[PDB]
Design an enzyme around this catalytic site. Sequence first.
Site, PDB file in Angstrom:
ATOM      1  N   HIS A   1       7.775  -7.523  -4.228  1.00 53.51           N
ATOM      2  CA  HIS A   1       6.467  -7.897  -4.747  1.00 53.51           C
ATOM      3  C   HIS A   1       6.558  -9.193  -5.547  1.00 53.51           C
ATOM      4  O   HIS A   1       6.973  -9.166  -6.716  1.00 53.51           O
ATOM      5  CB  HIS A   1       5.902  -6.768  -5.614  1.00 53.51           C
ATOM      6  CG  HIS A   1       5.554  -5.531  -4.846  1.00 53.51           C
ATOM      7  ND1 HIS A   1       4.296  -5.306  -4.328  1.00 53.51           N
ATOM      8  CD2 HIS A   1       6.301  -4.454  -4.504  1.00 53.51           C
ATOM      9  CE1 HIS A   1       4.283  -4.143  -3.702  1.00 53.51           C
ATOM     10  NE2 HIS A   1       5.486  -3.606  -3.795  1.00 53.51           N
TER      11      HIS A   1
ATOM     12  N   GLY B   1       0.805  -1.198   0.000  1.00 57.82           N
ATOM     13  CA  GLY B   1       0.000   0.000   0.000  1.00 57.82           C
ATOM     14  C   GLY B   1       0.845   1.258   0.000  1.00 57.82           C
ATOM     15  O   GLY B   1       2.035   1.235   0.334  1.00 57.82           O
TER      16      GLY B   1
ATOM     17  N   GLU C   1       4.077 -10.767  -6.741  1.00 56.08           N
ATOM     18  CA  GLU C   1       2.933 -10.858  -7.638  1.00 56.08           C
ATOM     19  C   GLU C   1       3.197 -10.262  -9.018  1.00 56.08           C
ATOM     20  O   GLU C   1       2.348 -10.405  -9.902  1.00 56.08           O
ATOM     21  CB  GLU C   1       1.712 -10.178  -7.003  1.00 56.08           C
ATOM     22  CG  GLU C   1       1.822  -8.665  -6.858  1.00 56.08           C
ATOM     23  CD  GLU C   1       2.537  -8.226  -5.589  1.00 56.08           C
ATOM     24  OE1 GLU C   1       3.338  -9.009  -5.034  1.00 56.08           O
ATOM     25  OE2 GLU C   1       2.290  -7.088  -5.140  1.00 56.08           O
TER      26      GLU C   1
ATOM     27  N   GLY D   1     -20.658  -9.834 -28.971  1.00 57.73           N
ATOM     28  CA  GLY D   1     -19.553 -10.476 -29.648  1.00 57.73           C
ATOM     29  C   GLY D   1     -18.197 -10.239 -29.012  1.00 57.73           C
ATOM     30  O   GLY D   1     -17.216 -10.859 -29.444  1.00 57.73           O
ATOM     31  N   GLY D   2     -18.110  -9.358 -28.018  1.00 53.85           N
ATOM     32  CA  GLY D   2     -16.927  -9.290 -27.180  1.00 53.85           C
ATOM     33  C   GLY D   2     -16.716 -10.589 -26.417  1.00 53.85           C
ATOM     34  O   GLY D   2     -17.571 -11.470 -26.368  1.00 53.85           O
ATOM     35  N   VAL D   3     -15.541 -10.693 -25.787  1.00 58.08           N
ATOM     36  CA  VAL D   3     -15.124 -11.956 -25.175  1.00 58.08           C
ATOM     37  C   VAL D   3     -16.078 -12.367 -24.061  1.00 58.08           C
ATOM     38  O   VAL D   3     -16.516 -13.520 -23.992  1.00 58.08           O
ATOM     39  CB  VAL D   3     -13.684 -11.849 -24.646  1.00 58.08           C
ATOM     40  CG1 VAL D   3     -13.277 -13.159 -23.992  1.00 58.08           C
ATOM     41  CG2 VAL D   3     -12.738 -11.475 -25.770  1.00 58.08           C
ATOM     42  N   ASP D   4     -16.394 -11.436 -23.155  1.00 62.90           N
ATOM     43  CA  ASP D   4     -17.190 -11.797 -21.987  1.00 62.90           C
ATOM     44  C   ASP D   4     -18.586 -12.263 -22.388  1.00 62.90           C
ATOM     45  O   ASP D   4     -19.065 -13.300 -21.911  1.00 62.90           O
ATOM     46  CB  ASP D   4     -17.269 -10.623 -21.010  1.00 62.90           C
ATOM     47  CG  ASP D   4     -15.905 -10.176 -20.531  1.00 62.90           C
ATOM     48  OD1 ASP D   4     -14.970 -10.999 -20.557  1.00 62.90           O
ATOM     49  OD2 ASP D   4     -15.767  -9.000 -20.133  1.00 62.90           O
ATOM     50  N   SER D   5     -19.255 -11.519 -23.272  1.00 58.46           N
ATOM     51  CA  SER D   5     -20.606 -11.922 -23.658  1.00 58.46           C
ATOM     52  C   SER D   5     -20.589 -13.198 -24.494  1.00 58.46           C
ATOM     53  O   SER D   5     -21.530 -13.999 -24.424  1.00 58.46           O
ATOM     54  CB  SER D   5     -21.316 -10.788 -24.407  1.00 58.46           C
ATOM     55  OG  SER D   5     -20.812 -10.636 -25.722  1.00 58.46           O
ATOM     56  N   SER D   6     -19.523 -13.416 -25.266  1.00 57.58           N
ATOM     57  CA  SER D   6     -19.389 -14.655 -26.025  1.00 57.58           C
ATOM     58  C   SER D   6     -19.289 -15.864 -25.096  1.00 57.58           C
ATOM     59  O   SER D   6     -19.954 -16.884 -25.310  1.00 57.58           O
ATOM     60  CB  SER D   6     -18.159 -14.579 -26.935  1.00 57.58           C
ATOM     61  OG  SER D   6     -18.264 -13.502 -27.852  1.00 57.58           O
TER      62      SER D   6
ATOM     63  N   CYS E   1       5.436  -6.253   1.427  1.00 55.17           N
ATOM     64  CA  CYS E   1       5.849  -4.867   1.608  1.00 55.17           C
ATOM     65  C   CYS E   1       5.133  -4.232   2.792  1.00 55.17           C
ATOM     66  O   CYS E   1       5.500  -4.483   3.945  1.00 55.17           O
ATOM     67  CB  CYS E   1       5.611  -4.068   0.328  1.00 55.17           C
ATOM     68  SG  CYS E   1       6.627  -4.633  -1.051  1.00 55.17           S
ATOM     69  N   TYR E   2       4.114  -3.410   2.526  1.00 53.91           N
ATOM     70  CA  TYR E   2       3.384  -2.788   3.628  1.00 53.91           C
ATOM     71  C   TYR E   2       2.718  -3.842   4.500  1.00 53.91           C
ATOM     72  O   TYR E   2       2.618  -3.673   5.722  1.00 53.91           O
ATOM     73  CB  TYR E   2       2.343  -1.796   3.107  1.00 53.91           C
ATOM     74  CG  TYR E   2       1.648  -1.030   4.219  1.00 53.91           C
ATOM     75  CD1 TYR E   2       2.184   0.153   4.714  1.00 53.91           C
ATOM     76  CD2 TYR E   2       0.465  -1.498   4.785  1.00 53.91           C
ATOM     77  CE1 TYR E   2       1.558   0.851   5.736  1.00 53.91           C
ATOM     78  CE2 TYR E   2      -0.164  -0.807   5.808  1.00 53.91           C
ATOM     79  CZ  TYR E   2       0.386   0.367   6.278  1.00 53.91           C
ATOM     80  OH  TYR E   2      -0.237   1.058   7.294  1.00 53.91           O
TER      81      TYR E   2
ATOM     82  N   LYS F   1     -10.145 -11.781 -16.043  1.00 47.34           N
ATOM     83  CA  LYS F   1     -10.200 -11.759 -17.507  1.00 47.34           C
ATOM     84  C   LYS F   1      -9.514 -12.972 -18.128  1.00 47.34           C
ATOM     85  O   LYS F   1     -10.027 -13.551 -19.092  1.00 47.34           O
ATOM     86  CB  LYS F   1      -9.558 -10.478 -18.044  1.00 47.34           C
ATOM     87  CG  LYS F   1     -10.314  -9.211 -17.719  1.00 47.34           C
ATOM     88  CD  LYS F   1      -9.589  -7.984 -18.280  1.00 47.34           C
ATOM     89  CE  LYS F   1     -10.428  -6.719 -18.123  1.00 47.34           C
ATOM     90  NZ  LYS F   1      -9.754  -5.528 -18.721  1.00 47.34           N
TER      91      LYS F   1
END
Lengths: 503, 499, 504, 505
Positions: free
Chosen positions: A175, A62, A177, A230-235, A89-90, A362
Site C-alpha cells: 500500500h 479490498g 497510500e 466556529g468549527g473549521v469547516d464553517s469558518s 493489492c487487490y 479535511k
Amino acid sequence: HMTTNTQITEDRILILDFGSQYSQLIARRVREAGVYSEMYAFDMSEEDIRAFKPNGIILSGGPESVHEEGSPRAPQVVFELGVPVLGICYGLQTMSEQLGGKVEPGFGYAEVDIVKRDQLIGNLQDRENQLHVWMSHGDKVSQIPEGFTITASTPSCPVAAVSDETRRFYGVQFHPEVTHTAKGEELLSNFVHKICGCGGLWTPEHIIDLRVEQLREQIGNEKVLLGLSGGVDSSVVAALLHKAIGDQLTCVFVDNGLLRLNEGDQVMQMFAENMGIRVIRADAEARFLNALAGVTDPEAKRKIIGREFIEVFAEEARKLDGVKFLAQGTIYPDVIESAANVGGLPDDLAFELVEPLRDLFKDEVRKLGTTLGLPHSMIYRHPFPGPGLGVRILGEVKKEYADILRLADDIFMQELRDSGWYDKTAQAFAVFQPVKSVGVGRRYAWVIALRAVETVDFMTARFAHLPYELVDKISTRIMNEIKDVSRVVYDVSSKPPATIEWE
Amino acid sequence: NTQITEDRILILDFGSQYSQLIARRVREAGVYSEMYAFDMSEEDIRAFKPNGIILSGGPESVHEEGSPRAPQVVFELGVPVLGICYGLQTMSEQLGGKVEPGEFGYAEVDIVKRDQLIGNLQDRENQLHVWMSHGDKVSQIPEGFTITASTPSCPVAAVSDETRRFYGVQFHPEVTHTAKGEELLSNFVHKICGCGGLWTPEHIIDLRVEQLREQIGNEKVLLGLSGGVDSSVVAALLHKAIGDQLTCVFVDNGLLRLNEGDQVMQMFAENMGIRVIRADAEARFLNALAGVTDPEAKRKIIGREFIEVFAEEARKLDGVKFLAQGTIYPDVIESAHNVGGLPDDLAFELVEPLRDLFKDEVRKLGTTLGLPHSMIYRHPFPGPGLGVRILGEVKKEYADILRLADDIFMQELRDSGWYDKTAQAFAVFQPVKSVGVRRYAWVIALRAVETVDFMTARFAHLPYELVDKISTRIMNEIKDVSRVVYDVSSKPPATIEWE
Amino acid sequence: NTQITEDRILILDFGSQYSQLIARRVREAGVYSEMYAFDMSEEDIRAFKPNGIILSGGPESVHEEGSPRAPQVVFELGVPVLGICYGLQTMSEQLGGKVEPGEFGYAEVDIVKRDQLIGNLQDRENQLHVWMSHGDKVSQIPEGFTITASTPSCPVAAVSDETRRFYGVQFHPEVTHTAKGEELLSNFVHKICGCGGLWTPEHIIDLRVEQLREQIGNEKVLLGLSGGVDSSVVAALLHKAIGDQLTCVFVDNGLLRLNEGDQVMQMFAENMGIRVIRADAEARFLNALAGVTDPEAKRKIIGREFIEVFAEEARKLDGVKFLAQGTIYPDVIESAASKQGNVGGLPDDLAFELVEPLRDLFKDEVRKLGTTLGLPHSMIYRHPFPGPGLGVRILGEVKKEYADILRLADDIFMQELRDSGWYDKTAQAFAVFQPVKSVGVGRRYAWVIALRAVETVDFMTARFAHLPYELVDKISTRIMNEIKDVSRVVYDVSSKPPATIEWE
Amino acid sequence: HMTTNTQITEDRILILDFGSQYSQLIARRVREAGVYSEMYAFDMSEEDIRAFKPNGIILSGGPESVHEEGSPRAPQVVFELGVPVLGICYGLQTMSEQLGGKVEPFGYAEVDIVKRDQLIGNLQDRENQLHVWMSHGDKVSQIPEGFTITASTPSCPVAAVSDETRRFYGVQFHPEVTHTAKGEELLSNFVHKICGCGGLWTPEHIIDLRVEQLREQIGNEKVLLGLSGGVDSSVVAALLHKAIGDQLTCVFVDNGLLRLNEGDQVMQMFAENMGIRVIRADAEARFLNALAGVTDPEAKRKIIGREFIEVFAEEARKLDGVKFLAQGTIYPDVIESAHNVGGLPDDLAFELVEPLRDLFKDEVRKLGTTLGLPHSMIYRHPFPGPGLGVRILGEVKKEYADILRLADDIFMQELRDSGWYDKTAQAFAVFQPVKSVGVVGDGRRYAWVIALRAVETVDFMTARFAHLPYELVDKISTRIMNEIKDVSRVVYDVSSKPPATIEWE
Ligand SMILES: [Cl-]
Ligand SMILES: [Cl-]
Ligand SMILES: [Cl-]
Ligand SMILES: [Cl-]
Ligand SMILES: [Cl-]
Ligand SMILES: [Cl-]
Ligand SMILES: [Cl-]
Ligand SMILES: [Cl-]
Ligand SMILES: [Cl-]
Ligand SMILES: [Cl-]
Ligand SMILES: [Cl-]
Ligand SMILES: [Cl-]
Ligand SMILES: [Mg+2]
Ligand SMILES: [Mg+2]
C-alpha cells in the site's frame, strides 16, 4: 457569458474503490501531489468513466478474493482507454486476472527487493535497491499477465510489483497510500506525474481563485445564509463567502447553552468584529435546557438537541428577506459517504445549496483557511460534536453541571495550549460525571473526567501519552480552582473497544 | 499589491525576549509589522507611518539613570500606543506618572473597566488569566488615564487614556500563557488602530512575486539549494517569479542523510521542473575530514569546503547577476565581506525573498504554493550535517552506519506520528562499542528535543514503547550496532547537537 | 530474652513530621527505642534508663517566647544526646549558646572536624550530602563545643562536645534525603552510646513468644482475622505461642475482594492449621446498606454490623478470656501533637482482656517478623484494605450487582499488577465502581470503572502512580473486553493533597 | 557424638528438571510454601531418588516433545514409589505417555474447572475458572485410565488431570510463574494437602539449623572469608560471626574498581558496626597498572579476575593455621540443570565452608533480614566481579574511574531518595570515552558523555530498560552535568535484553 476557468482540474486521476479502508488515502495523496482526484465505487459505469476523462486510474485494495464467485472486478474499459493504470493489492490481483494472469489464494512491514526499475519505482529506494513497505499478506499473483515484468519481490512474495510499460499498467502488492510505506508518496508521485503526465496546479492558492470565481458565478447578486458554529469547516466557508460576495453573506450563530466557556463571545469577536461579517446571535440556552430537563437517555438527548437547533435556526432564517441560498460546510468525505429538505429545515424554507468545500478533503480545507489568513488556533482546533457539552455531561443535563464543566474544560484547554500538547493530540475535552468523592474540612464534590486521544482517522484512537507532570498540573489546578470538583480522572480507554465521546 | 503593507504596526524593542512575539502576533492578526530598537530616530518613526505603536517589555528599570525611554514622538503622532510591562512603565513615567521599584508567573486580573483593548474579553467572568510581570509597578497613573484591570498585588494591571488612545498592560499578551493574549492584541491592531487584514499568505505571494520580477527583470539568479524549509520556499517563489531564469546548485557533501541527494533532485528537478545542478562532493569532504578529531576544526573544514565547491559550480555559469539566499526576518533583526562569503571573482547582487518574513510565515507561504507537508514541516538540519553527529573523526564507514540508524529513527517517528511532535530528532554515532548477543559493535545515540525557540530545549517525552521499538529495530537490522541509548540531557546545559 | 531491650534510645518529640523516622532508624540499627513528647517528666526519663537521647526537630523557634524546651535532666544524666535541627537549637540555648532567627532543601556540608558522629563518613571527599532545615541558625555555640561541619550559608551545620558527649546537626539524618543519614545515626547509637544490636526479628520473636505465654498461660484467646498484614502476623505469633488455645473469627461482610474469604480460610485454617470460624454475612450487610447513599452513613452501618456479627460469633465460644488485636506502635505512640489532645467495642456481656502482640512494633518490623516466621511475600506485602472494604469503593448505594462487577474489575487490575511486577511498586491500588454509564462498541452502554493507584511512604502525601502507559492500556482493555457490564476505564490522576486516597 | 537436628528437611519435594527455563521456579515456590526441596535432572538414578526419600515428586516442563527421538522420560520408579506426582506441561505429557495415555503433537488462558480434585481444591479466579499461563503445543490426546480431566479450555480439552487413587496430578499450564494467578496456591495444595508436608522450612528455623551445622563442621577452627559487601558474602559473614565469633577472619580487597567510598563502607559496617575482624587490602595501583593499555573487554575481565585471586592469596598466606575458606555459593550456583579450592594457588589448601549453598537468592535475603541486617545491605543490586572495570568502555584509567564513581553516586542517591532504587533490579552509570559540547553560561564545555543503565527483571534472563519517570531522569542528568565538570551530557540505555546485554562489557 463568461464562465469560470477550470484549468486546474483538467489533469485528474480516477480512484476506483474496491473496499479498502485506505482508498480515500489514495485520493488524498494524489491531491497532496498537486493533482485533482475523485473516488468512485469499483462498478462505476463505462459512461461515467469515459466522461470523467481521467489521465490515469488507480484500482484500490479490498477485503475480497478474486477466486471467490461474485468477487469484484474492474470495468473492462479501464484497460482500454489508453491511460495508465495502477493496481494496489487487490487492484493488482484483479488486473492480473482480467488480463490473462492467475491469482492463487493464501498486514505487516516487509523489505521488498527492487529487481527492475520501471517508471513507477524510478530511482527510489530506502536501503539500497530495497523498499520498506506495508504489505498485505493474503492473496498473491501466481502468474503475471502477458507483457508484464516483475519489478520487485520478496522471498515470501515473488510478485511484489509488476508493470507492463507498453500498455502502462502498474501493480503493487503493498500500500503506497499509507505512512507505513516509507516511499509511498514518492511512488504515487511518480505515477501521477511521470507516468500519467499530470501537472501540479491543484494547490491552495489556485483552489482559492477557482472557488471564489465559482461562488461568484453561482451566487451573482443573491444573498447567502450560513449557519456559523466556529468549527473549521464553517469558518473557512464564512471566509470564502466573505471574500467572494462580501455583505451578501449573512451568518446565524446559535448559542445552545452547550458550548464551552465564552464560546459565543469568541465567535462574535472573530467573525463579526475582526472579520466584519454580519452575524446574528441567537441565545437559546434556556430553551435547550428546558427541552433537556429530565432527559437521561443519551440517544434521546442527541435527538432533542439536533431538533431544537434546527427549529431555532429556522426561526432565525424566517426573519431574513429574499435569501436564495443556504451555505453549508459539506466536505468531500461527506459526499463520498453518502453515495456508499435542504438543510434539514422545515418545508416553509426553500433554499438552494452552496457547498464550497464539497470537493475538498479535511487537510485541504485547513490549507485553504491558512492561505486566506485564518489563524492557527481556528484552523487546527479539535472537532466539537454537534450536541456539544450535551454529550459530555453524563445523564441529565443541568445548567449547574454545564457551568462547572465549562470551567474545568477551560483549565484543561489552557494547560494543553500553554504546554504545546494541544496540537499533539487529535481531541481533548473534559467530561462531567454526576458522582461525588471526598476531598479535604472534608467536603464531597463532583468527579471530573479528562479525555484526550491520538488518531489520524478517528476510526482507531489511543488515549493520549500526556506527560505525567502535565496531567498532575491539570488535575491540581482543576481541584484547586473549582470548589465543586473533588477529584479528576483520566480516560485510559482506547478505541476500540471504547468510543471517543462518552455519549 | 503594495496596498497590503499600508496598514502597519511599529514595535519598539526595549530588550524583552518576547519582543519578536509581539511582531509575530500582529502579522498573525493580518497586519504588517516591523520591529526596531527603542532608540529609533524620530525621522525613521515618522517615515514608517505607523497606524499604531507597541512598546515592548525589557529587563531595565525606569528609575535607573540612563534607562531606556520611548522617543517622545511616539506620543505625538496622534496614533494609538500600547505599552507592555516596561513599555507601560516608561509610558507612565514620560507622561507625568510614577513607577515604584519592586519574577514571571500566572495571575488572574480583575477587569474593572472594559475599554477598547479589553472589550468583551474574559476568561472566568470579568477576569483574565495572564502571564504577569512582577517587580516594578506603576504607583501613580498619568492624568487622563483610567485603571482598567488590577490584581491584589498589582493594583495597576492595565490602564488606558482613550482620548489620546494610550493603552498599557503589566502582563504579556504576546505569549501563549496569557489566555486571551491574541485577542487583546487583535483588539489593539484592528479595533483601536483601524488596521485591516490584508497581510495573508495569498496576498504576500502576489506582492513578493511582483517585487521579485521588478528586482530581477529578465536576469539570471543562482540559488544554493539544501532542502531546508527556507531554501525550498525561496526556490518555489523564484520558480514562480522568474521560471527558467533560476539555476540551483545542490551540494552532496557526503554528510547528508540516507538518499537525501536523490530526494532533493526528485522533488526540485523532477517534480517541480527547476534546473538543479548536483555536485557530488562526498570524497572531497571525507578526504578533508580524514584524521581530524576536533569538532571546531571539523566545522571550519566543512564550511570552507562547501563554499569552495559552491564557488566552483557558480563559476561554470554564464551571465548570472543575482545570488538568492534564504534570509528570514529574524536574521535581519539580529544583524541590526563579499556577497555569499564567496571569492572576489564572484560579484553577485543579493536576492532575499523571505527577509521580511518570520519562520511560520515562510511555512504558510510554502503551503499556499502547494509544497508538501514533509518538506514544509521538516526539522532543521545543521550546515555541517552528519559531520557534527559522528563524534571525533568522520569516516565513510561511520556515516554509512549512521545513515541507516537515522533512517530507522525517522521512519518510526513519521509512522507513529511523533516526528511532528518533536522540534528536532536525529541519531548520533558514538565510536565506542558494547557487547550484544556474542556481538561487539557500535553504540548509537538518539537525540530528540521539544522546544519552541531552540534557546532552551527539553529532551522529548517519547513513549516508552516507541523508543523500545526504535532501539530493537536498530539493533536487529544493523549488524554493526550493539546498543542504542537516548539523550536525556536538556538545553541548558547540554546543546542540541553533540558537536 | 528481656536483655534485648536493655540497650535503648529515648527520642523526645518536638513536633517534627520526621520524629517517628528517628525511632524507626534506631530500631533498624538494632537498638530498642521509644518516642515521647518533649515535655516527658523527669521521673519517667530516669525510669526509662536511656543509653542515649535524641532531640528531634520541630516547627517552633526558640527566640519566640512560649516555645518548647528540653528538660535539663537530658543534659545531666551523663548519657550522650543528639540534637536534630530544633533539638540542636534548644540544646545550644540551654547550654550557653545563642540562636538567631532566619524552608527545606538539599545541601553539601563541609566536614571540618571528624568527631565520633561523623567518623570516617563522607559522600564526596570531606563532604556530606544532606537535607537541611534552614531558617533559624546557631550564632554562638555553647562552651566546650567545637563546630564539626559547615556550609557557606550555615556556618554551624554540626557540633560536638565529646567530653560531655552532646552532638547536634542542622540537617535531618533520619530521612532518605540525607545520603549518610543511616550511618550517622548508627555511629550515634553504637559508637557513641555503646548500644549493641540485639533488637532483631529473630530475637523479637523469642521475646514476644515468651511474653505472650506469660500473659496468656493456658487461657483461650479470640482473634478477629481480616487477612491484613497486622492480623496475619498476630495470628502467626499467637499460633506459635499458644497453639490450640487460639480461635479466629473471620467475617465475610460481602464487601471483600474476589474469593477473599476462601483465601483467608485456605491460608490460615488449611495451610497454617489455625482454628478459624467463618461468618458468611454478605446478605446481612447488603440488606443493611440497601437504599443508603450517604457515605458517612454507609461507614457507620458497616462498622456497626461488623461489631454485631463479631459479637454474635464471640458469644458462641466457651470460656475465652482474651481478645487479641493488631495494634502497632504508631497507633499508640506519643507525639508532641497527640499529647495535646468495652474491649473491642463489644457489647457489655463480652468482657475480654486485651492482648496486643505488635503494640511496640513499627509497620516494617511487623513485616520482618512475619517474614521470619515464614509467612509468604504476598501476605506480608499486601496493600492496606479499609475497614469498610468495597463499601467505600462503590460510590453511593452499594448493591450486590455493583460489588460483583467491581470484584471482577479489581481482580483483573490486581492480576496485571502482580504479573507485571508493579503491585510492589505501588503503595495502594484498587478499582472503584462509579454508577455512571458511557457508550462502547453493536453499541454498548455500561458502567465506567475507575482505577486508583498511589505512591507514598507515609500516606500523608501521595502521588498518583507512574504506571507504564502500556500496562494501564492492557488493564483497561482486559476490563472492557472481559466484563460485559463495563464500557470504559478511567485512571485517578489526583494526588494527595488535595485529593484523598479512598474516594469515600 | 551429638549431631545437628535436621528435622526441618525431613519433609521434602523432589523436582525433576526436563529442561524448562522455569524449573528452578518450581523448587523456589515449594520453599516459599515452607517445604524443603531439591532439583535434579530428569535422568536421576533410581538409587538417588530412593535415597532422597521424597514426600512428592514434581516433573518439570521441557522444550522437548514426547514423540521426538531421544525425548526424555521420567524414571519409571517415579510412578512406583507410592508418593504423589505432579506433572507440569512436558511432565504431564511424559506422565501420560508412560502410563498408557496418548500424546498428540505461550499465552494466557481461562481454563474451565470441570472437577475439583485436591490439587485445584476450592481455588478459582473467576468462578469455576483459573487464569493461567498456558503452553500451547503438545497436547494429551488420551489420558491414562484411572485419570479424570479436571480442567479444560475449548482449544485444550485436557488442561489438567488427576488420578487420585495413585495420586498422580498434571497441568498443561505453569503454576510456578507469576503469570498463573493461582500458581502459588496450586503448588501449596500439592505439597501440603496432597503430599502431607509441613511448614518448618522458614527463616527462623533455617537460621537455627545452619548455625548448628556450621558449629559442627568448624568446631574451634578458623575460617577465612573473602568479603565483598555483596548480599551473599554479607549474609555469610553475619552467619559465621553468629556461629563462631572471633574464629572468623575476613579479607576485603579494594581493587580500585569499586564505587565511591565502598571500602570505607565495608569496614564501617562489618568491622566497626558488627565487630568482625576485617583485613583491608588497598590494591588500586596494582589493578590499574595491570589494566594499563588494555582495551579488549575479555582481556580486562581475565586480568581483573587473575589479579584479585593473587591479592587474596597474598593476604591468605599471612594468616596462620586457618583450616577453612568460606564462600557465598548459593543453590543456583550448584544446581543440577538439564580445580583448587577457591581457585587459589596450590600452596593454599583450604576446606570449603558454604553456608548458603542450599539456598535460593530470596531465602538468603530472608535470612539476612532475620539476623537484623539493614534493608540497604540485603536489597542491594548485584555488582559484577570486575566492578567498574566493565563499566568503563575500553581502557581503564584512574581518571575515568574517579569521574564514573561521582556520576554513579549521583545516580544512586537519586534512585534511593526517590524510592526508585528498589523499583529496579539493576542500575549503574557507564563511562563512555567520547565527548560532546555543553553550554555553561557564556562558556563552552567539551567533556565526557555518561550513560545510565537501569533494568527491570526477575530472572536476568530477559530484562527491559526501566520505566523511570521522565522528571526523575531529568533531575539525575541535570545533577550530573551541574556537579561534575568532566561530564558534558547524560544518555540513557534504552536497549532491552534481548538483543542487548545488561552490562556493556
Ligand atoms: Cl460561558
Ligand atoms: Cl495525535
Ligand atoms: Cl468514536
Ligand atoms: Cl545515501
Ligand atoms: Cl516540540
Ligand atoms: Cl544548541
Ligand atoms: Cl467472591
Ligand atoms: Cl510506592
Ligand atoms: Cl487519604
Ligand atoms: Cl572512592
Ligand atoms: Cl524490577
Ligand atoms: Cl546480560
Ligand atoms: Mg451562563
Ligand atoms: Mg458471590
